[PDB]
Design a binder for this molecule. Structure first.
Ligand SMILES: Cc1cc2nc3c(=O)[nH]c(=O)nc-3n(C[C@H](O)[C@H](O)[C@H](O)COP(=O)(O)O)c2cc1C
Ligand SMILES: Cc1cc2nc3c(=O)[nH]c(=O)nc-3n(C[C@H](O)[C@H](O)[C@H](O)COP(=O)(O)O)c2cc1C
Lengths: 313, 313
């Protein structure tokens, strides 16, 4: 029995990694994720220039999950490119690099510089089309024409395999249209479902006030709140994109939650809110818990149950 | 201190009612809701002809809430019209009648016949533009041109005040567009936020199966999962429709949860999943709990805190 897997021409000790934005902004953060038991890591979504992000308080956690409006705080593309080119030890585990430009032009500028480093070192691109927290900037992938434009321009300028981070959808027609767009692009090798559930609102009953400062209290939701939403999106894209991989993200706290994502179709499994709250020790616990479920059910490898969720009748 | 209030030229003993679809399908259900301590009731969303609905199992409850794909099972418009015209005791509490046609023509047919009974009896229309469960029929109010057409045709055919049941949105640009559409129609006097969070997926770890039969297990979410999403939508429409009323629906289990909805802008407060699980006894508990919170805080009336949620400077 083992958790080993091979995909995208890389070898992984296990399917677990951080979700983009959690424990991955500074060199210190990245070294910490590398020293953990995780199978891989991804860097903070970056822009051409460094950003301070939105005013504090901008993150708050609760029993059922988290709300945030960070505002894309990051050290700038030059820093994350240098980490991938000169600093990361690829003998420990694979590295993904996330980008989130504020226009199609900004993304194209970054991928032109990323390409030679990807060719030499094997760093893997995750393109973020789902940030719900920059004021005046609605989620790119909720506009299918803008989506098609970003993907055409990036494919042409990069010319190498990449993946896409998607927002959650709630409508069968939207699942149908979005997956069809993705299937037009052979360079898109993986689809990560999902980013935060956008523009929720948490209110404190005692103080009668919202709990985060930006955007009048409105922010993206993660954790226990979003698990059935995340599983729905993972399965919807697994069914509709049979020639691509799907990565699961949303509501993972336990080996059982990871088992459900994998049954739905997930290859890698990403951990956000639960990692932010518990710290990187979570990865040894998730491995132990998934192996014990597999033992009890008589499963020896991940391929024996990936995508095998059963429907009724 | 009492919770009585006046809205839409009617008097209500308190702000509580059932959510459409819960405890309101049969004559028995409607009599039971009328005998409860609720301030009002709403009937099951209806169609021109009787419907059996989707195959069973089609509803399942869990610690954090519920999933359903009912498929609009109902006794037919003729039955609910007769209940409103001949059977309901208007001396006990006001009645709302919900309609959910599968086309614009079907809704228009129903409202032409509802109009004389609304004139004579004072029954109030709730028009459902957000059912997420009928195969091949996407949520009407996620298509803004369809939404506008429904409201134009219904306004002309009915000619009397009414309200609209809305789906949840997750995008600031969508809040902006949807509220602008609503503000084109003076006859729309109330907006109910929200219907279920559409097309989630619950999976049982032991059996490795989805838990409902229709639509390969995909169904609408209610309960603890959806409270921050519901509060966001109530506040967004309260801010953008200052000349209309907003009714809150989603994630209400306690007087505290009702207090948060009212602070966000709610006039009436609807109860779905919690009512389905606990039964009509819930209404005496919600009233007692809300009055206690008001006394502790020194609030004599609902008007003193409605819409008064504080933001961070
Ligand atoms: C503090 C915070 C920062 C985040 N930053 C990013 C980001 O930089 N890029 C991105 O694609 N997602 C970002 N996310 C979204 C997460 O990657 C993830 O999609 C989401 O939190 C849902 O997973 P969860 O339920 O495990 O939290 C962030 C989330 C939080 C909590
Ligand atoms: C059993 C079931 C049936 C429902 N039927 C309807 C319906 O006929 N019309 C409608 O507008 N909403 C219907 N709903 C949605 C609810 O009115 C409500 O919007 C949703 O359940 C969220 O509120 P909650 O968190 O209190 O459950 C139904 C929900 C459930 C649980």
């Amino acid at each position: 029995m083992c958790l080993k897997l091979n995909l995208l021409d890389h070898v992984f000790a296990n399917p677990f990694m951080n979700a983009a934005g959690v424990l991955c902004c500074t060199e210190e953060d990245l070294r910490c994720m590398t020293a953990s038991s995780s199978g891989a890591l991804v860097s903070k979504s970056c822009t051409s220039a460094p950003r301070d992000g939105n005013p504090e308080p901008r993150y708050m956690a609760f029993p059922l999950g988290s709300i945030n409006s960070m505002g894309l705080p990051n050290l700038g593309f030059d820093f994350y490119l240098k980490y991938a080119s000169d600093l990361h030890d690829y003998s420990k585990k694979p590295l993904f690099l996330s980008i989130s430009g504020l226009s199609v032009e900004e993304n194209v500028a970054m991928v032109r510089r990323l390409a030679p480093v990807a060719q030499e070192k094997g760093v893997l691109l995750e393109l973020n089309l789902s940030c719900p927290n920059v004021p005046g900037k609605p989620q790119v992938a909720y506009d299918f024409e803008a989506m098609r434009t970003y993907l055409q321009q990036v494919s042409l300028a990069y010319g190498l395999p990449f993946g896409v981070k998607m927002p959650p959808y709630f409508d069968i027609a939207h699942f149908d249209t979005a997956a069809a767009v993705l299937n037009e692009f052979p360079l898109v090798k993986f689809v990560t479902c999902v980013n935060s559930v956008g523009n929720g609102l948490v209110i404190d009953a005692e103080s009668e006030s919202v709990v985060i400062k930006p955007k009048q209290g409105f922010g993206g939701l993660g954790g226990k709140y979003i698990l059935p939403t995340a599983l729905a999106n993972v399965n919807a894209f697994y069914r509709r994109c049979p020639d691509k991989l799907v990565f699961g993200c949303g509501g993972v706290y336990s080996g059982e939650d990871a088992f459900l994502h994998i049954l739905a179709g997930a290859s890698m499994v990403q951990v956000g809110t639960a990692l932010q709250e518990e710290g990187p020790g979570i990865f040894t616990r998730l491995e132990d818990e998934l192996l014990e479920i597999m033992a009890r059910k008589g499963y020896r490898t991940l391929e024996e149950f990936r995508g095998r969720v059963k429907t009724i009748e």
